[PDB]
């Protein structure tokens, strides 16, 4: 079990002004630290944030959080469940800012909600430095779904934070799971009039509502009013300096949802073209794992050890990545299926 700590800086808050926090399991022997960002979509105006507060309140508030959590998948401390990093220091950071971890805005007389995701990450890192992170050799910032996109938005800022604080020896790296989306043509169309709003338009509105922040080099490329581009992995990844491993199902359920897909020729060609386009964007990503499955998230699932690409599991590929950061015979790090239909890989989740 990981133990809850609410942030000592009470000005860094969840949506409703309650303190943000983190769950921690220390490993005294180890100089490896895993900081995991939870996911779960977002909200981008008063009306759809109010709805999220009624029936998804744990994603908006710490008032009802439990005192402990069990570590699962890559956050497990049992080598049988976690062949990769079972002896690491483990941190789970709950997602309570509804801003894809991009926001820097406080609740105030003009703001019903606070959107502080970017500041929550920075404050967790601080307070951890007084609990043993100051002795680390590797900090892996990982996350799933909205948390995976959050890795891409925040990994270089964590690296810059630690450099300016006087810790040049800690190696910061990223692991982005199910956060690599395409701003592609939808299978059926609707103008943005919540349910009808495409992610490009929803994120453009959200950035303005959240006071959202994107990595500096990407911001400089796309400039004012076009920062939404940096929420799409294939556009922001080439601007990053930190090593980032990309995990992405070729037919992600969240991607199909935003494409208005729920089989005849038209839809067959649409689905096959989606897999080809995703594979094309990963062509020159040297650390990646992309199976031809219809699913969503993987790295904190207990059975994450079961899926393989070309005979190599995800825990193995991540271990091969570690070795490469010290090509390797029989220990690959770029693993992308070429078969073109969901579940053409027999190891896909059921
Ligand atoms: C608390 O967090 C706020 C928001 O990031 C920051 O401006 C302030 O400096 C922090 N205070 C301390 C004492 O760390
Ligand atoms: N939790 C799923 C999720 C997906 C997204 C998302 C992020 C960027 C672009 C399109 C969708 N945000 O959250």
Please check whether residue 120 is in contact with residue 5, taking contact to mean a CB–CB distance below 8 angstroms.
Answer: no
Strand duo 294-295 + 251-252: pairing: parallel
Q: What spacing in Å lies between the alpha carbon of 201 and ligand 1's midpoint?
A: 32
Degrees to nearest 5, angle at CA 259 with 209 and 189: 85
100 lines ligand 2 (CB under 6 A): yes
- Ligand number nearest CA of 40 is 2
254 lines ligand 2 (CB under 6 A): yes
Which of 149, 182, 198, 253 should be mutated for ligand 2, with most atoms under 8 A from CB? 149
Show Cβ contacts of residue 178 under 8 Å, excluding neighbours closer than 6 positions. Answer: 39, 144, 145, 148, 247, 248, 249, 252, 254, 296, 297, 298
* Residue 14, beta-bridge partner list: none
Distance CA 185, CA 241 (A): 30
Please check whether residue 144 is in contact with residue 39, taking contact to mean a CB–CB distance below 8 angstroms.
Answer: yes
Locate the domains of the chain by residue range: 1-350
9 lines ligand 1 (CB under 6 A): yes
3-class state of residue 222 by DSSP = helix
11 lines ligand 1 (CB under 6 A): yes
Q: What spacing in Å lies between the alpha carbon of 103 and ligand 1's midpoint?
A: 15
Distance CA 283, CA 310 (A): 16
Distance CA 53, CA 66 (A): 18
125 lines ligand 1 (CB under 6 A): no
Q: How many angstroms separate the Cα of 313 from the Cα of each of 218, 278, 303?
A: 32, 20, 11
What does DSSP assign to residue 13? B
Strand duo 288-290 + 334-336: pairing: parallel
Burial of 178 (0-12, 13-18, 19+ CB in 10 A): buried
The minimum-distance atom of ligand 2 relative to the CA of 231 is 8
- Ligand number nearest CA of 56 is 2
Distance CA 219, CA 224 (A): 8
Residue with CA at minimum distance from ligand 1 atom 4: 12
3-class state of residue 82 by DSSP = coil
The per-residue b/e assignment along 134-167, b for 16 or more CB within 10 angstroms, e otherwise, is: eebebbbbbbbbbbbbbbbbbbbbbbebbeeeeb
Please check whether residue 290 is in contact with residue 278, taking contact to mean a CB–CB distance below 8 angstroms.
Answer: yes
49 lines ligand 1 (CB under 6 A): no
Which of 43, 48, 100 should be mutated for ligand 2, with most atoms under 8 A from CB? 100
Residue with CA at minimum distance from ligand 1 atom 5: 119
- Ligand number nearest CA of 152 is 2
Distance CA 252, CA 273 (A): 13
Exposure on the CB side of residue 310, measured as CA atoms within 13 A: 14
Please check whether residue 101 is in contact with residue 137, taking contact to mean a CB–CB distance below 8 angstroms.
Answer: no
Helix and strand numbers (H, E) in the chain are 9, 14
Residue with tokens 């080809």: 276
**What is the distance, to the nearest Å, from the Cα of residue 132 to the centroid of all Cα atoms in its chain?**
24
3-class state of residue 350 by DSSP = coil
Show Cβ contacts of residue 179 under 8 Å, excluding neighbours closer than 6 positions. Answer: 39, 143, 144, 145, 146, 147, 148, 149, 150, 151, 152, 233, 248
Kindly report the backbone phi and psi dihedral angles of residue 313, in degrees, each rounded to the nearest multiple of 5, phi listed first: -80, 165
3-class state of residue 238 by DSSP = helix
């Amino acid at each position: 079990d990981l133990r809850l700590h609410l942030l000592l800086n009470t000005s860094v808050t969840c949506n409703d002004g309650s303190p943000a926090g983190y769950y921690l399991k220390e490993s005294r022997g180890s100089r490896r630290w895993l900081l995991f960002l939870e996911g779960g979509w977002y909200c981008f105006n008063r009306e759809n944030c109010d709805s999220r507060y009624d029936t998804m309140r744990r994603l908006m508030s710490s008032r009802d959080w439990p005192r402990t959590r069990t570590g699962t998948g890559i956050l497990s401390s049992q080598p049988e469940e976690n062949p990769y990093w079972w002896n690491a220091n483990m941190v789970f950071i709950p997602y309570c800012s509804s801003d894809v971890w991009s926001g820097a805005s406080s609740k105030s007389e003009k703001n019903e909600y606070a959107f502080m995701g970017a500041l929550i990450i920075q404050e967790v890192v601080r307070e951890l430095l007084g609990r043993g992170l100051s002795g680390a050799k590797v900090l892996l910032l990982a996350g799933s779904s909205a948390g995976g996109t959050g890795v891409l938005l925040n990994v270089d800022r964590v690296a810059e934070q630690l450099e300016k604080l006087g810790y040049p020896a800690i190696q910061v790296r990223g692991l982005a799971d199910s956060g690599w989306f395409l701003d592609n043509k939808q299978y059926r169309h609707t103008d943005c009039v919540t349910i009808t709003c495409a992610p490009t338009e929803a994120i453009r509105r959200g950035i303005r509502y959240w006071n959202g922040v994107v990595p500096e080099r990407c911001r400089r490329q796309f400039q004012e009013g076009e920062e939404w581009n940096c929420f799409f992995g294939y556009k922001v990844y080439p601007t990053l300096r930190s090593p980032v491993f990309v995990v992405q199902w070729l037919f992600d359920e969240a991607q199909l949802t935003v494409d208005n897909v729920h089989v005849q020729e038209g839809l067959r060609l649409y689905i096959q073209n989606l897999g080809r386009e995703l594979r094309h964007t990963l062509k020159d990503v040297p650390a990646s794992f992309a199976p031809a499955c219809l699913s969503h998230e993987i790295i904190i699932r207990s059975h994450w050890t079961d899926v393989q690409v070309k005979g190599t599991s995800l825990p193995r590929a991540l271990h091969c990545w570690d070795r490469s950061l010290h090509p390797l015979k029989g220990c690959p790090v770029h693993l992308v299926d070429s078969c073109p239909w969901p579940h053409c890989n027999p190891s896909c989740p059921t």
